[PDB]
RNA sequence: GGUUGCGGCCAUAUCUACCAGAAAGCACCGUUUCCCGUCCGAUCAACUGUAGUUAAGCUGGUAAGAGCCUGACCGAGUAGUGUAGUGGGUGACCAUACGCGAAACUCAGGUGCUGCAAUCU
RNA sequence: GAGAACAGAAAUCUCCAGUAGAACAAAAGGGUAAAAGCCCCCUUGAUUUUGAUUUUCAGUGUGAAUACAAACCAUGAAAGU
RNA sequence: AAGCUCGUAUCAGUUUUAUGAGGUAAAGCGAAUGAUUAGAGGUUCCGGGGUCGAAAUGACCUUGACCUAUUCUCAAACUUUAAAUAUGUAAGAAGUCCUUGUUACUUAAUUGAACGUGGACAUUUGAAUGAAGAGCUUUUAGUGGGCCAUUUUUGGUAAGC
């Protein structure tokens, strides 16, 4: 839980699939630390479908800079690993 | 778990002093160390670079190497059944001269002075030192001096 | 209203520090010698500016005390023709020329290493003569002066470099250094050396505000020295320094002991213990 | 004695304690700019209290200092607002005096409804010549006790000029 | 003997309260064109030694002051401690023999000393 | 501690006192005041080549560390680091 | 155990003269630092650890954030001063002094540094006592379960623990 990174959501694009949590809203999200002076925007499907709106602070795992050392993570297909996993909405 | 770090058990030995904190005075740097001089080691707490280990606090060595900021000192340390000859590189704040050697160098000049002076007279060089002798017989004076009588005191509490 | 415990535990700082004169973090880096030299003293050009006076010295280090090798002051310049303005930028250049030609005379490196003489205000430092003795190397000591470009301090440095002393320095704190391009203006630097920045201001204040031209610059009007002749003052002055930087002292009066016979009268003396005990008794 | 032991009005420190940052802070800055004639500097918060609504490093307040002859003229215009009348307070034990007003449209230039209404704090320091020795770099020292300013000396000075009252 | 520049040793030099200082040196002080730096020529920059001052800084003195530093048939040869005994004591611990031996306190005295270069009734 | 509109226990501003009672990524112990803390300006020496030396020690390893030499640079007006 | 080079060599579980280092016993709390046993309130002056939420003006539970008033204690993990016993080095010939040789280091400089030529200082040659010789080397056996006593102590009620 100590690896969570603050994210700021730009908008929510839902695909209309919903099991019990409004499945697969393609959230366009940007980093809290890079929103100020950068132009860098990430693009990710997530289960946080209905509870998320524009300008909300969410927490997330950030795979793009993390060098894990698991043999299970090493035995994957890297180009199928997402850059962002949205974990929970803050406040 | 045990603790055997590089500065363990040095709480009171690397403290600076009482009312002597702050920067060092400039006659520490201006002194001159030539190869072969007898030096003493006392680790300064404020200057962390080039610092002697906690063993060599208080030992005494000989300077063999002189470099920019530091001096090279040899120390005889015992281990097991044998002396070894270990070498250090101490910055000049931690080092200081030994006055026992400095009194030796001026006693040689006095010993050379007495031999050359006694040769002009011709006898009795008399140059070795002698320890404390038992004293000679002498006569004390009771003139204006009566021997005062003492006695043991009784017991009182006054507590 | 200070407790007895407060004065009990009190690191009293060093004597030159609570008086506020000497930085000791700077002094350690200036004094120390590479220990493989064993004796070689590190000579420090000490340039200190008071108001209305300029002090320049060449000193070394010893545990008993610092040893002065040679020194000159701003008030020796009326011997060399400079009367008024003996604390400006230009007189600071003349004093650094005076210590250099003096310390090369008493040392022996006088005939060689003449330095520049046709001075144009261009950054260069002295070069070692082929198959000869090396020039005398003196480092700069500034004390507590804030280092800003165009200062009076580096003018005393420029007189030292032109006199022949080896002083390591850059060209960026001289006046006329440009911020955008990293070059020096040699024409504008040559103005400051001969008092151009003062003689320019004698022009603008003349026609516009006559009221202050009597109050300021009054020594100029008394000797009738106009603005354009100010550049001719220092030009004759630098050649006067090359002739005889011999430092003859003065007579001061009859002797020294007449000075001590005066100053005893005005200082108070300590009372004795029994005279103190008589005052406690009353 | 008299001859150089004289009071003076060393600096005047205008202050506007804006509650929360924003464009309302920058509209307060243009008030001090047209008043003092200089560019004001802005101060940041030290801590986050959250009962006032502030956060750390927010550029919460502005202030500008005025020295020289221009400080006396702004001081005269401020005292006319309160009719040369101050309380038994407003004079510190060090000898300095200050007072705060509100609704700056009552003095000065104009109303100008785009910029709004603001209240200022005026604070005046007092010293004598020779106070350089505490501010300078080389040979720093402290001023002796008989040359220091007191509360009693300022009120004796402030009654003499401007014909004012400490009535409380 | 007094100042100033540069120190050495770093409170016998500091701290608090009042007083005195000729000469010169310092210091306050006057101005903002230029190099330069600030919200503010206050600090630093430059400019004049000019309009003026010992009011401050600085130096010297005084205080049965606070602090600090030396001593002493001061406390005390006491506290502790190294060796020895088929010594005492149910013990706890304590005496002796050959030895080393403090600290707080008490009183008495002290309140910077000096190196280099220059300049001063 | 004493002062300033709204403003109080706590906003911002000012002075006096202030031997570190603060701060220095973290455990505790050292250390530090014109700094080793706070705020600015410039930079990559957190680099290349291999030896000597300290600590645990069998005077082997491993980790960490000190002082140099030969190169190349950073910074500063400079000593230097 | 086999020996080898040498035989007054300078070494020594010691003292003295000189000079270092240390923070335990004792002292101190009217010199800094200082616990303990308990613990009542103040609802966005915080939430820290949760939990449920189609969300946040969002709920519920809890340690509380807060000690908001004073009150004693002394000290292995508190300190200005500081023992005793134990501990490091020096007491010369591989030394001191004149004198001038060496160099690519160093100095403004034949200044320093380092190593030397030639000359001078010997039986008291630089404190005491002792020295069944001093010094170096090769090679291999056994052992790697310990225990007791005075003193200093840690855990423990205490123990032939």
Numbering used by the authors:
A (entry chain V): 312 to 402
B (entry chain g): 2 to 160
C (entry chain G): 7 to 288
D (entry chain M): 6 to 173
Paper text:
To capture a series of particles downstream of the ECL particle, we partially arrested ribosome biogenesis in vivo with diazaborine, an inhibitor of the AAA-ATPase activity of Drg1. In all three classes, Nog1, Bud20, Mrt4, and Rlp24 have been released, while Rpl40 (eL40) and Rpl24 (eL24) have loaded. This rotation involves a rigid body rotation of the tip of the stalk (H43 and 44) with Rpl12 that is accomplished by bending of H42, which forms the stem of the stalk.
Ribosomes are the molecular machines that all cells depend on for protein synthesis. However, ribosomal subunits are exported to the cytoplasm in a functionally inactive and immature state, requiring the further addition of ribosomal proteins and the removal of transacting factors that block ligand binding sites. In the cytoplasm, the pre-60S particle follows a hierarchical pathway of assembly events coordinated with the release of biogenesis factors. Using cryo-EM of 60S precursors trapped from yeast, we captured six intermediates in late nuclear and cytoplasmic 60S assembly at ~3.5–3.8 Å resolution, which provide unprecedented mechanistic insights into 60S maturation.
